[PDB]
Design a protein around this ligand. Sequence first.
Ligand SMILES: CN(C)CCCC(=O)Nc1cccc(-c2c(-c3ccccc3)oc3ncnc(N[C@H](CO)c4ccccc4)c23)c1
Ligand SMILES: CN(C)CCCC(=O)Nc1cccc(-c2c(-c3ccccc3)oc3ncnc(N[C@H](CO)c4ccccc4)c23)c1
Lengths: 300, 300
Amino acid sequence: GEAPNQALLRILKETEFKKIKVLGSGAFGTVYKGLWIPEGEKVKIPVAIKELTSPKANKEILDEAYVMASVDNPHVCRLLGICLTSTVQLITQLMPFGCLLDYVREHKDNIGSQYLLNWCVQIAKGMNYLEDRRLVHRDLAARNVLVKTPQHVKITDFGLAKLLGAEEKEYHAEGGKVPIKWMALESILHRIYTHQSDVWSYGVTVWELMTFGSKPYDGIPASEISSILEKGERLPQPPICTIDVYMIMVKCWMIDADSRPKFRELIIEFSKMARDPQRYLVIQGDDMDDVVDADEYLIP
Amino acid sequence: GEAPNQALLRILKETEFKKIKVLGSGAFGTVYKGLWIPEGEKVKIPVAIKELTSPKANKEILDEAYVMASVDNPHVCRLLGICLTSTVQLITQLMPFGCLLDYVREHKDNIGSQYLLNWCVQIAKGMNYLEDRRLVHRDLAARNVLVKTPQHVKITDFGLAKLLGAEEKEYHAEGGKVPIKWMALESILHRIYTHQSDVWSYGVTVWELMTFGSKPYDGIPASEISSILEKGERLPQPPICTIDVYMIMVKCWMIDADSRPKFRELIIEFSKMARDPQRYLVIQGDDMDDVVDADEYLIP
Ligand SMILES: CN(C)CCCC(=O)Nc1cccc(-c2c(-c3ccccc3)oc3ncnc(N[C@H](CO)c4ccccc4)c23)c1
Ligand SMILES: CN(C)CCCC(=O)Nc1cccc(-c2c(-c3ccccc3)oc3ncnc(N[C@H](CO)c4ccccc4)c23)c1
């Protein structure tokens, strides 16, 4: 009827792995840095460990496990396993440089156009993988893209992700509590989510990167966003962005979802731009200008 | 009778230059970071400014000015000028990375053998220049070599330097107060200073670099150093040093000063070693070893 999901859910013993330090905490619970040492082999795998014993929350962690266990792509984070302790723990590959949002914020002065454009390509590849797997992410943002190395990023945080049937094109949400400033207008108005609603969020994610981590609609409270977007207002053209790049962003933000580009198209277009990055992003780097070194100023 | 010293002593107005920050203070006085802007030209020269009104000290500052004004070489710091304020100020090119001693101490983990050996060559070139100018430095150490860039260092601090006559081979000091752990044995015993006594100090300076800024004879008080050296004891072979390199150090430390190498020989020998650095210095860089990244550990 539909393709059997034959993904393997690996169960790990708590004794196999070692918590080293807390990486962060919040409403999601807390995330630890750790080492995972399977008894049989001589390997030590660096890992991130996530835990929250509420009933609804336990169901949600396992829903997140299902999705991470079912994805396998170089630009998306996979679940390594779970540990069934007093509270359930998710285990995944450590992404040492943290989320991309924080990375761009505290490396503005050393991030070149080659890296910005390559990230855009990589995220588009991960999303296209997810689309092929009939999976709608529903929470794409710079904070949900992690950095394994500065040249390799991965999509993560599938806590809102939803699978789709072969005979199904959208997902009608309920209750909500979704990040408003990253979601498509049809999602705000009618709680509809598509692969093309993820493309909107991709647009906003790209906007974050090009603005080096600025908050979208900084001065605006969530309740207005709907009407602003209804009026035809969008995120402004970032300083470093040529019209070429900003045109792609704007295309991701059109009312007619089918008019928006597909992730495979976005891969291609950003791939093209990555071949000649300084034509498409204008960055200063890539105090006074009359300064001269003493041993080039010779006796007059 | 002897070669006229036709060096120019440039006098600068205090209004020409701008103190930006104190770089350091001590018995020498204080040194400021600054910018020098000659009124006529559109240049802004980064400079270091040094001031101490004692009578003997004023004579000494001017003696230091004489020497710095009389040297011109890429591996020695020249005097740009002096400013005749309430107290006299020496002005020279800023060496932004500070003294080499501090540099090696706080970059151990990122200093490769190529840099260590090249520095050794550069210092030897500067000293050979000084020898040609008939000038005996008398205070060569890692602290008196400044870093313009990580790949270009310069000799400085001529406060003990002495000029020599064409018919003269040594300098008999008086009073003293000279750094004991860097000076040759004949200087400790008989207050004699030569170009070959500077070579001893060069040996100790190289030892500092190869030990990444260790204090020579760390546990020993100054009064013993004479007898230790008299007994045949020397600084130990640093961990990273091949016998080839340590042999050069030891040669710099022989009783018979004429047996010690000349700076021109030291230039050559270290130059040769700089062509294949990892043959002559063994450094680890140039936690566990069973660590494996999660996306190279595939499902068993
Ligand atoms: C609530 N979310 C929608 C927003 C997530 C933003 C966030 O705070 N992410 C986050 C928080 C804490 C840790 C990590 C994380 C890090 C990390 C490493 C160094 C410094 C800072 C963060 O590395 C990671 N590697 C893999 N996953 C990570 N976190 C996700 C959950 O965000 C995760 C999911 C499942 C299992 C393990 C970890 C991570 C990532
Ligand atoms: C007492 N001496 C035998 C030991 C000197 C060790 C020392 O403290 N040197 C020192 C002290 C203060 C400033 C400098 C210096 C720096 C510098 C820059 C950044 C951070 C730290 C230090 O840069 C310099 N560029 C040129 N000369 C410098 N100092 C020498 C006197 O050490 C100097 C001599 C004459 C005029 C100006 C400066 C310097 C160098």
